[PDB]
Design a protein around this ligand. Structure first.
Ligand SMILES: N[C@@H](CCC(=O)O)C(=O)O
Ligand SMILES: N[C@@H](CCC(=O)O)C(=O)O
Lengths: 258, 258
């Protein structure tokens, strides 16, 4: 059986190549997770098809209907065999799907337009001139929704009722909104993505403050899938061989424009 | 059944309390992993006994006899039910025991006495005046032994044949050897431990350079143990609630003397 890989368009993990219109199948895409999929496939000995998640989302469970969306839902409902993506390992996801040991570490962070008078999450929470938000249907939004920490709770109370809406549908929309809002929008996103964009044209954004948490992305499979074991071993081996570090360098530091 | 916890004496993870001679059972010990054991036990609903690993080691497999020593061996040979320790998740360990998702991130790093003319691993490898080494029977030594990276391979060729021996039996011996050798010994140890000691009296050591790798410590159980699932969920929950971050702060930043 050809392994159906679910993944998500997200720089520098999975990106349409320049001439994608003329390209076929897996060849349409490039990035860290494109390279990683190839290495995992080589180590586990499977053939695979990269497919972009149908709804464009990471994964969240609707509070009323209890249905999972995003790449999580594709795995839960048997629409994909494996997810190879910047997908955050979280408790509520761990309950419904299997995860590899992490292939990359990150924490939630703040992106500002250069020159925005904000140095921390505490600064954000203590003012209203600079709007701030996050991604729909992902781990960063859930973090704020669930936080009992005073500063993060204050931020969520603001965010969930802010008008016009402070939430975005894709990280790319979040980044454009920081860029275009002249310092009146700050975006809460994972350090990995924040640090990537800080090194890309037009070099107009920066990460401020430390990370708000510490977590990891894992390769995900349906609960109890036979692929799980081999893939976990593959990630550990690829880490230990220095390949994950070589890929990080390829897609972040070598992609630097600033 | 009372859960037999194997762990290792290592600051600030597990340490004899000041008045330990007069103290009984679990009360003899304090530290990050002492606190963490208590939280995991509370979430999983078990009673437990902390025991210090009989041989004082993390875990390695003898190349001739193929026997596992350290906390890894206690789990493999059925002498402990769970290991709660700064135990590095590695491929060869993953093959023989179960690991939680990580509870802490780290990478191998260099400790120097203040003022030692060394800024990196490349600096170390390109000279012989300053001896350097690492811990027996742990992941840092294995990293060098297995490295195909030129700089790390050069370091290992030096280390494995250096006289007098550059290896130490405990990290505490490694740290004392840096302190006493007047800048002629540098110690290769995990960033977590290096950063702890940098903030302790007599404030005479420092971490130089970036980390050489990126990995994680996991709670370990015998392969297929029924405890595994609950403990993994507990670690993810404790991370998400901010408790792991609160413990890090308790045992590192609040323990600061420098
Ligand atoms: N990695 C996140 C998506 C990005 C975000 O939430 O900021 C997730 O898996 O949900
Ligand atoms: N955490 C390491 C021990 C310390 C070291 O090797 O530097 C291990 O699990 O083997």
């Amino acid at each position: 059986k050809t392994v159906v890989v679910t993944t998500i368009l997200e720089s520098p993990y999975v990106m349409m190549k320049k001439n994608h219109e003329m390209l076929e199948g897996n060849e349409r895409y490039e990035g860290y997770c494109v390279d990683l999929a190839a290495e995992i496939a080589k180590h586990c000995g499977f053939k695979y098809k990269l497919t972009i998640v149908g709804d464009g989302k990471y994964g969240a469970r609707d509070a009323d209907t209890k249905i999972w969306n995003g790449m999580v839902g594709e795995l839960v409902y048997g629409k994909a065999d494996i997810a190879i993506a910047p997908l955050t390992i979280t408790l509520v996801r761990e309950e419904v799907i299997d995860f590899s040991k992490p292939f990359m570490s990150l924490g939630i962070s703040i992106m500002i337009k250069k020159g925005t008078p904000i140095e921390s999450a505490e600064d954000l929470s203590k003012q209203t001139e600079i709007a701030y938000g996050t991604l729909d249907s992902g781990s960063t939004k859930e973090f704020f929704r669930r936080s009992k920490i005073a500063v993060f709770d204050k931020m969520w109370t603001y965010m969930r009722s802010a008008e016009p809406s402070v939430f975005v549908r894709t990280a790319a929309e979040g980044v454009a909104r920081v860029r275009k809002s002249k310092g009146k929008y700050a975006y809460l996103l994972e350090s990995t993505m924040n640090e990537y964009i800080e090194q890309r044209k037009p070099c107009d954004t920066m990460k401020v403050g430390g990370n708000l948490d510490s977590k990891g992305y894992g390769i995900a499979t349906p609960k109890g899938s036979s692929l799980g074991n081999a893939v976990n071993l593959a990630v550990l081996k690829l880490n230990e061989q220095g390949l994950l570090d070589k890929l990080k360098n390829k897609w972040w530091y070598d992609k630097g424009e600033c």
